[PDB]
């Protein structure tokens, strides 16, 4: 269990994917040219999980960039770390997906999927022990949601014994591009329920609410939202790419976090919540990190943890701090929220600490929760789906691509089944 294959598809997938690679590249001391200029060998002990090596001692991210139009991927090349990516790993079309799940999943995307799989196959053939795949994408568009899930289904067919991990951005009217996003998300969620082992639910509604309410940003941009996604992606992957007490891998993660196959959608949280470019002078105490990361205002999924119950919980601390104080503060937040943990999964809270702090923060904490309160997110999407679907509004964009109404009815039923499944374990 060593290398992970990264995949980013669509506009949102590639923008958050690009930000993820320039953030961890800095943490590991890799510059935009792919050469290491760090000071600690702990930056390279497990560098092969996300990076390959080449002659001249260069590290190339094991990443594949996918999109049906060139726009966003042209941005990546001209980006800060755009040159680190292997040029052959750029696979893009010209027609686009028009924010249409059908176009990405059945028509336009079907035309391009095989060439993406050829790149995936080439990356896997070089792996000494492939853990699986991590995919970044949105669910409200066409390429990321439609073609992203088509890739997931076809990747599982070829690699049924590898872990599938995704960072999936949920749509929100507060930050919406099109009115059909509830359609694209509902169709995608069903795919994720069947063909992923772990999915980090990154809710654009929570990202917006955090920027507006907490960060005091009157009009947040996608850059401000991706600043929160960037910090969370670094946090939840720290234990995969750095040596520490917990040398995590994708399979052990799923075994310990997912008690039931379909309930593999995680609520991410981060602390302290910070604005881009705004330097924080006062570092947080361990009690503050613990209280915030369990606070509903720090959740990256617009759900109230108090409305449900935790099946499994993981907290990763970064920086030089007192483990004894970490242990004491964890036991005390568990006591305050003692009513919100299931009693039929003993010792369902995992604590990990990494000594290397992320850029700009002397210590931080990343929250990873498998809470039944995540049903509020899927219920919100369902209501928005049903509101349009009961009148078949905007359905012609999809039937024009070969889809039938029955497929929508099935997606609606599947998600309501998912919601009811979370509800039964919330009353257990």
């Amino acid at each position: 269990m060593r290398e992970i294959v990264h995949i980013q598809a669509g506009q949102c997938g590639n923008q958050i994917g690009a930000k993820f690679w320039e953030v961890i590249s800095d943490e590991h001391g890799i510059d935009p040219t792919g050469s290491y200029h760090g000071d600690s060998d702990l930056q390279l002990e497990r560098i092969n999980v996300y990076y390959n090596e080449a002659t001249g001692n260069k590290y190339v991210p094991r990443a594949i960039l996918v999109d049906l139009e060139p726009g966003t991927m042209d941005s990546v090349r001209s980006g800060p770390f755009g040159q680190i990516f292997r040029p052959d790993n750029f696979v893009f079309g010209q027609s686009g997906a028009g924010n249409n799940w059908a176009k990405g999943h059945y028509t336009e995307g079907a035309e391009l999927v095989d060439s993406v799989l050829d790149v995936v196959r080439k990356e896997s053939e070089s792996c000494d022990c492939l853990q699986g795949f991590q995919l970044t994408h949105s669910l409200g568009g066409g390429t990321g949601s439609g073609m992203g899930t088509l890739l997931i289904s076809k990747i599982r067919e070829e690699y049924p014994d590898r872990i599938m991990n995704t960072f999936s951005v949920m749509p929100s009217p507060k930050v919406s591009d099109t009115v059909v996003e509830p359609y694209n998300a509902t169709l995608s969620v069903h795919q994720l329920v069947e063909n992923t082992d772990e999915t980090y639910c990154i809710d654009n509604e929570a990202l917006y609410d955090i920027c507006f309410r907490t960060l005091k940003l009157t009009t947040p941009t996608y850059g401000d939202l991706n600043h929160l996604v960037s910090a969370t992606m670094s946090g939840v992957t720290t234990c995969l790419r750095f040596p520490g007490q917990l040398n995590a891998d994708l399979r052990k993660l799923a075994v310990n976090m997912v008690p039931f196959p379909r309930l593999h959608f995680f609520m991410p949280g981060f602390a302290p919540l910070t604005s881009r470019g705004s330097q924080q002078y006062r570092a947080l105490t361990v009690p503050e990190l613990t209280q915030q990361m369990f606070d509903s205002k720090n959740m990256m999924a617009a759900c109230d943890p108090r409305h449900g119950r935790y099946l499994t919980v993981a907290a990763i601390f970064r920086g030089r701090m007192s483990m004894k104080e970490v242990d004491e503060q964890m036991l005390n937040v568990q006591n305050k929220n003692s009513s919100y943990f299931v009693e039929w999964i003993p010792n369902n809270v995992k604590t990990a600490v990494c000594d290397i702090p992320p850029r700009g923060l002397k210590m931080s904490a990343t929250f990873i929760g498998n809470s039944t309160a995540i049903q509020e997110l899927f219920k919100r999407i369902s209501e928005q789906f049903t509101a349009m679907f009961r009148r078949k509004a905007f359905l012609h964009w999809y039937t024009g691509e070969g889809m039938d109404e029955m497929e929508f009815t099935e997606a609606e039923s599947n998600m309501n089944d998912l919601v009811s499944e979370y509800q039964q374990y919330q009353d257990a």
């Binding site: 242990d327 004491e328 036991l331 568990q334 006591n335 305050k336 003692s338 009513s339 009693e343």
Partner: protein
């Protein structure tokens, strides 16, 4: 914010303790099966002592002493006293008793013929106190109930307030089938006595009255004539089993409330009858006793943000 769980809904005493703990604003009640508790008000049977004291970062306390059953079972108490050198077979405050598997007046748990009692057992045998101290007016029998609290440090606290459980019907040596004048239990006197409640309310006389009567009737006091023996009997029983039930070096801690029942004969000699591990309290004394448990048995381990007991040093 301390946490506790309730596993004996029928305990009136700890139902009151549970009420006080909640009123402090610093205690939180969890579901009866949540393992993350600081205090456990356990059940009367098969209490899972083996699961206590294994929760990281939690100091755990329970309101029962594992192994205290040897003292609160009639058959076990007799074997404990006979086979323990500290108590001995020459013990002078425990009536002669014998274990049997299925003046010469005896009681089984009342007959003067051995074959009558042995047939009933097949259908503990203890010497019956034929000369018991009799209250007046009334010429009536009684027994004394003493509440004792033992904390995690094994301090022996005797509640200053005791109760006398009296027989409304005057005592009679002639017929042992009367029973209502031979058995002092509160429940029986309610359903077998027309005289129930004539002298003292609910057949419950408290110490201030009993002390006064002893002074007027016998020119003595309760402390000198009875309480010295009671305090000695309590100290002797609990010190005997201390090495077997102490939680001084255990991963969990125990405290327990005991109900000692004594008898007093005509010569002002106190006899031990039995010990109860899950005793009920007197109606008037619930408020004071239950707060006393929280003061010395709970808050001593879990502090918050004159004494009603008598510490029996040992």
């Amino acid at each position: 914010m301390y946490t506790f769980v309730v596993r004996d809904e029928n305990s009136s005493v700890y139902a009151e303790v549970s009420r006080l703990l909640l009123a402090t604003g610093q205690w939180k009640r969890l579901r009866k099966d949540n393992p993350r508790f600081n205090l456990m008000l356990g059940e009367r049977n098969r209490l899972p002592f083996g699961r206590l004291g294994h929760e990281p970062g939690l100091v755990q306390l329970v309101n029962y002493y594992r192994g205290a059953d040897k003292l609160c079972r009639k058959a076990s108490l007799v074997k404990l006293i006979k086979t323990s050198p500290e108590l001995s077979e020459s013990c002078t405050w425990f009536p002669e008793s014998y274990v049997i598997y299925p003046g010469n007046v005896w009681i089984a748990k009342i007959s003067s013929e051995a074959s009558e009692l042995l047939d009933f057992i097949d259908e503990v045998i203890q010497k019956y106190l034929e000369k018991p101290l009799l209250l007046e007016p009334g010429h009536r029998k009684f027994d004394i109930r003493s509440w004792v609290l033992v904390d995690h440090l094994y301090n022996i606290y005797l509640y200053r307030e005791g109760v006398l459980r009296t027989s409304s019907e005057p005592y009679n040596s002639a017929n042992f089938q009367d029973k209502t004048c031979h058995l002092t239990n509160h429940c029986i006197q309610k359903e077998y006595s027309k005289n129930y409640g004539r002298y003292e309310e609910g057949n419950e006389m408290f110490f201030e009255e009993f002390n006064q009567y002893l002074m007027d009737a016998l020119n003595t006091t309760l402390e000198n004539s009875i309480l010295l023996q009671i305090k000695h009997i309590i100290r002797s029983c609990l010190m005997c089993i201390e090495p077997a039930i102490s939680t001084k070096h255990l991963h969990y801690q125990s405290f327990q409330l005991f109900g000692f029942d004594f008898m007093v004969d005509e010569e002002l000699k106190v006899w031990l009858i039995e010990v109860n591990g899950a005793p009920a309290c007197a109606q008037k004394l619930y408020a004071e006793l239950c707060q006393g448990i929280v003061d010395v048995a709970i808050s001593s381990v879990f502090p918050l943000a004159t004494s009603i007991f008598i510490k029996l040093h040992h």
